[PDB]
Amino acid sequence: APKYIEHFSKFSPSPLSMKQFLDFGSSNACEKTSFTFLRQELPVRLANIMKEINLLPDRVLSTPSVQLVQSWYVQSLLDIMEFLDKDPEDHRTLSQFTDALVTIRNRHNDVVPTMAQGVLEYKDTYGDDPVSNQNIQYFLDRFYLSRISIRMLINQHTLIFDHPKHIGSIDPNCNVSEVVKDAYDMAKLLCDKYYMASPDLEIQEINAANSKQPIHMVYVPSHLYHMLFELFKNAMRATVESHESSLILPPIKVMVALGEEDLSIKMSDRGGGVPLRKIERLFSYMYSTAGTPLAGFGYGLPISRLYAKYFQGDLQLFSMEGFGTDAVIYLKALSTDSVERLPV
């Protein structure tokens, strides 16, 4: 296993473009090609994340939760190693490979909260929240983004080779407003259940080049949903908790803008805002302004920002203390600008 990790960590993960994802999940989709690609690329990506995990201080690495996560990565690498000698022409190989990728995806379902638990186990033993937080911040960004990239490759294979007009998890005609409404509907269910009130949603679209046209892009809807759902939970909590005695809640306003290069989604709340001093902290792992279902374990904003960065986007927060907050997701408008951002 240390042998496999050293061999595969000699290679660099290969960033894939949206055009490649669409081409390889198209009419010409060949399962044998996907198999011979992934039995090289997934060990490369697994070995590079296992190297990233070994760049943690020995005291974080020795926590039971981090050792558990490490044991999963080892097991997953060994599962794929079983396929290196197997024959792509044999339909049993291809079927076993798909089953193995489903097993790996399922084994890693709770990586995010488990890795979070290891960071808390480090505090329960050393009793300290000092300047090693910048090192952990840096590592967890790289770790969780690498993981988004591995699950993207596994989802593409299992969806294609095991709505219906998608290419695996990609919707080439992703209606951005529809995903906004879906995220809002699900946040609103949680908000209504706990607070018995929720703000309304207003959506405005600005299609600069085509004023009357609904805004569509090539994107992974589940990634956009994740970001917007996390931002809606924040905007709805801020709005209801700042208007605890009001019959009238100010609405959440979403603008979807399509320019030449950027598709921008701004979510504006009137939840009372945050002082500028507190913004950088909101993007820290496990920092929380907060049981309300609208509050998590402080992972919503930093993970959501990784989803945005993954296809060359970004996620920014700008607040005005005493009024409210704007959260902006920046995506690449063009499929030809949309390439995996993999930690280097």
Added chain:
Amino acid sequence: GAPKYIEHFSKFSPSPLSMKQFLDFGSSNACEKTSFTFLRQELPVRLANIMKEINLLPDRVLSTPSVQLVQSWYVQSLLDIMEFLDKDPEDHRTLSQFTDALVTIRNRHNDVVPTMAQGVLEYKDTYGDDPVSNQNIQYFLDRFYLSRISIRMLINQHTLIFDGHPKHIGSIDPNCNVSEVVKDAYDMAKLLCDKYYMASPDLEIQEINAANSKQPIHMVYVPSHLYHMLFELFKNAMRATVESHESSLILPPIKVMVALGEEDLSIKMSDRGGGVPLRKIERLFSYMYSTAGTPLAGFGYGLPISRLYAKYFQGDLQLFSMEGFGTDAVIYLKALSTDSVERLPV
């Protein structure tokens, strides 16, 4: 005599002053002899530290005629203040000579910003060089121009208080009505916009005083600093708005929100000038980068200098755009005088 004076005074660190200290020392109890004995130590300390900052430039930028000229001004200004070290504070003519000397220094340095910019262009005309030295230049110029804002603030306080509108403590308005400064900046930008384009967007101002909803928003601030930032942001918003609506009879207005929270006084300026792609935002804050003769465009110094004015009393200035719609520029100031302290580079 000069490299000796610079070494002696650079042993000291500039002392950050708070809004309470500025108000107290320009108050009822204002003593000119106290201001003199303070500034004849603090100004040489600040001059020596900026002259050290200038010597941290690569030899090729430092040897340009424009940078050598700026260096010669700082040297002459340090020597002018050195003449006062032995002079008697009890002699009222010492104090009058000191004020005259500070006016001379302020006037001598009036063109520092564009002269320093010329030295950066002289460096390109000789090397060609626009590569990876730009981050070093950016880093140095931020520290240089902010140190200069701080020296001019001290000189302006002394000459406005002790040389002789009327409720001000030197350049500080303890009851600075933020909306009034917004209107002043807008009126002046609008004159330039009308003169060149023969059209200008209207202004809408909304105030949100979270703790006191019906109260006008006031703070302790230096109006001329707030004016500078808002005037530069209005020029940008007006240019973007008119140049994206070159065939329209109707221009969308510029909207300003002034919000007062417990800790922050935030001023957002929102235009519908078509916005900028996210890739281009970082370079708007770069010295001498220009999206651009129109008086609404400069030599690419508006945003980075404006951000230094915001940083100087522990604020900030941020830009966020939506390509195809428009741009929000936010000035963040400290609401409370007790949080308002000089940010000095050492």
